[PDB]
């Protein structure tokens, strides 16, 4: 009777929190573009359609986006995929050479400067004995002055080599699905209002995440997943001004960007079986690549985020905006990759406003760099080939990244500024809803039964 | 006969409910445990980690009284100094997630008790069939 006996139970549904590796998998349409032209099909099992997303009752768990793991391995994995997509492509060693340059043929006003320089130089042919004289075009942000005459050299040829990307492999993102291996599960908070920390009362488990498209952008993150109703701000410690502020807003706002100059590529040969792509003639007028957004939608969404931001700082507060304070190139402006070419576009025209306590379109001008260096690795510079024809691209602005100014000395206004910083925050805008947990079977409980001899 | 009855849920589906209702389904929580160019190394070490964990659990269950019963009982009496709970409340009140934080202190001893109990029972029945 009162001699209760222990009983072991295998497969009790219970878990703990843990950390492990994960699993990369995408759809079957990515295999139609054959022969690994897109990346993430070297290492991708095709996803199985309609995975289970099972719902749960009463059980309530707490989440934390800020000490969350698996974002770190995502930031590792994208870098590793980027590096694996380059070693089968050609090096650009014999290109570091003395360049004879001049201005392009254009009726130039004297005070404006040329954005294009026109250079000619020597290059080895297929044989070793012949050498030829050839010409091409470059942007001003790639050549510098070596020091009568006037001659230049490339910017990177004093610290590193340079690798050209292959023109086969594309750059557009594709929906990467993450999945857990056998013996774990991924939880998901389905609550409508959950700022990013604490308990969530309606959970659901899952085996694989939704579609995630990895895009690289510094401010004003693109093609993201908007929230349901309101505009949500999230931060780690708000009164601390060291941490960024992530703003996810509800309705997407359209953005256009375009480069209008018609371009002609040209194939120089370096030697045996080595191709190289210059930028040949320019058919048309030299215009400037730019971006358009609508006026009133932008003003209305900024009114939305002011109305939501006022709750975290008291109602009677003047709030204003300002452009970026300074630093290197790709953090003042915002920067992205459209059509297989990289844009750096000035954003000072959008963040100039002040807000009291109670048809036309905005343009902004951009610049074009040909060589890039993402992640600021110490010996890794990447060239990018030019493309053909007029380029334009349409997208949805979805979120924002902000930073409070550390204002002491008794001022009621609280200015805000955009700041790019890490690349990790763009993934943290999408993995704010998943923690990974580990199954544990074999519970043990007392009850009234006893094993016979 | 049945217009609308509770059919079954996915694995960890019942885990919010009480333990008495959750004990009706274990096979679902048991089956989803085995199965359903540097990356191949990560997949292979994931798979062998999975089978290593499952084999450890099978061996640890094998050294007690029940190899493959999936529900066992044994001959170790419950000491009430661990749990201080009534019988009437636990099967109709609490969840396993709620249970595990309560019984977290008294672990790693009960396992050794089961080991010694199974060992002594095996040697005594060995002596019984020895005189048989």
């Amino acid at each position, epitope marked *: 009777a009162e001699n209760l006996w222990v009983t072991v139970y295998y497969g009790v549904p219970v878990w703990k929190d843990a950390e492990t590796t994960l699993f990369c998998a995408s759809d079957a349409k990515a295999y139609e573009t054959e022969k690994h032209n897109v990346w993430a099909t070297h290492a991708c099992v095709p996803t199985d359609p*309609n995975p289970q997303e099972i*719902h749960l009752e009463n059980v309530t768990e707490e989440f934390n986006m800020w000490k969350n793991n698996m974002v770190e391995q995502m930031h590792t994995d994208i870098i590793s995929l980027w590096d694996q997509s380059l070693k089968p492509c050609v090096k650009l060693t014999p290109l570091c050479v003395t360049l004879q340059c001049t201005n392009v043929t254009n009726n130039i006003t004297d005070d404006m400067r040329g954005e294009l320089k026109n250079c000619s130089f020597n290059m080895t042919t297929e044989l070793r004995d012949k050498k030829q004289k050839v010409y091409s075009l470059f942007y001003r942000l790639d050549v510098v002055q070596i020091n009568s005459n006037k001659e230049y050299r490339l910017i990177n040829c004093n610290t590193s080599a340079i690798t050209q990307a292959c023109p086969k492999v594309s750059f557009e993102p594709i929906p990467i699905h993450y999945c857990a291996p056998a013996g774990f599960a991924i939880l998901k908070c389905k609550d409508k209002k959950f700022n990013g920390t604490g308990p969530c009362p309606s959970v659901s488990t899952v085996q694989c995440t939704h579609g995630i498209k990895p895009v690289v952008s510094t401010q004003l993150l693109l093609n993201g997943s908007l929230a349901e109703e309101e505009v949500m701000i999230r931060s780690e410690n708000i009164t601390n001004n060291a941490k960024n502020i992530l703003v996810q807003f509800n309705t997407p706002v359209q953005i256009n960007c375009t480069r209008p100059n018609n371009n002609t590529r040209k194939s120089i040969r370096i030697g045996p079986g080595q191709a190289f792509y210059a930028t040949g003639d320019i058919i048309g007028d030299i215009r400037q690549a730019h971006c358009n957004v609508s006026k009133a939608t932008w003003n209305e969404t900024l009114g939305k985020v002011v109305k939501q931001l006022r709750k975290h700082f008291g109602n009677n507060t003047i709030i204003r905006f300002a452009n970026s304070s300074g630093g290197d190139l790709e953090v003042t402006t915002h920067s992205f990759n459209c059509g297989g070419e990289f844009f750096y576009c000035n954003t000072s025209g959008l963040f100039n406003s002040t807000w009291i306590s109670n048809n036309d379109s905005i343009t902004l001008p951009c610049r074009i760099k040909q060589i890039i260096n993402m992640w600021q690795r110490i010996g890794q510079a990447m060239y990018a080939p030019p493309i053909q024809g007029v380029i334009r691209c349409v997208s949805n602005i979805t979120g924002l990244i902000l930073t409070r100014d550390g204002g002491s000395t008794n001022s009621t206004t609280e200015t805000f500024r955009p700041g790019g910083g890490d690349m990790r925050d763009n993934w943290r805008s999408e993995l704010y809803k998943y923690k990974v947990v580990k199954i544990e079977p074999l519970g043990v409980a007392p009850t009234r039964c006893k094993r016979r001899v | *006969a*049945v*217009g*609308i009855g*509770a059919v079954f849920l996915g694995f960890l589906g019942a885990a919010g409910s009480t333990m008495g209702a959750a004990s009706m389904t274990l096979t679902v929580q048991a089956r989803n445990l085995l199965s359903g160019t540097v990356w191949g190394i990560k997949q292979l070490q994931a798979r062998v980690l999975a089978v290593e964990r499952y084999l450890r659990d099978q061996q640890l269950l094998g050294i007690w009284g029940c190899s493959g019963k999936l529900i066992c009982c044994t001959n170790v009496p419950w000491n009430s100094s661990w749990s201080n709970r009534n019988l009437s409340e636990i099967w109709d009140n609490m969840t396993w997630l709620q249970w595990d934080k309560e019984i977290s202190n008294y672990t790693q001893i009960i396992y050794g008790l089961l080991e010694e109990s199974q060992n002594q029972q095996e040697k005594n029945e060995q002596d019984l069939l020895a005189l048989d």
Partner: antibody
Amino acid sequence: VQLQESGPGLVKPSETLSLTCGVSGGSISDAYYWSWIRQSPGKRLEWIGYIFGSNGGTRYNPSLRSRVSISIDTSKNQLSLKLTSVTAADTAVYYCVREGVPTEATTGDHWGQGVPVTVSS
Amino acid sequence: QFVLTQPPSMSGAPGQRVTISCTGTNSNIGVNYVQWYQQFPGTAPKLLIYENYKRPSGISDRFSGSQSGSSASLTITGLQSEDEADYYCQSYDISLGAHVFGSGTELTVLG
């Protein structure tokens, strides 16, 4: 075992509709499920919730889970439904049902007669 | 939105044999039991088929039921004039965690 419905047919907006389901010929404590079903205009059928007869364990639709509550009183042999802050989508006909015996020659499910409930100002 | 899809209306001569198909996904039909219900207009519904092929007492063996994959089917052999009604398929779904109904099918008997 017969099932019948009771309550006001008209509810003001943002208020709480209440329903009483009266059962004859049997106990409410029996090992059976008791469920509420509503039917919108256009005959859109929608499950609300159910509660087991013996111990009273509940399961609702999650999509309305904030505003719905179901209770049982064995003393009056009655089922009770409460829905707070009703709006125009909740105009519906309401039935309360018992699941039926798991035997060979059952009558099938056991249906109520129904109450029509209008949300209006 | 209904996670269970049916064609909305169908008609047939008396004595005919028809098949009403209920179409859903694996996550609800493929693991659970499905039921077939009958209601007249202005009338509380009645169970016809429970557990995909079985009929309770009080109901004739005139109807038959089958289930395959993510689809269910009821078959009427020898349609009678009484069967002008609305029929529904119903099951339980994991992903919503809820019982769900079909699109509804109004059987209007010809003749």
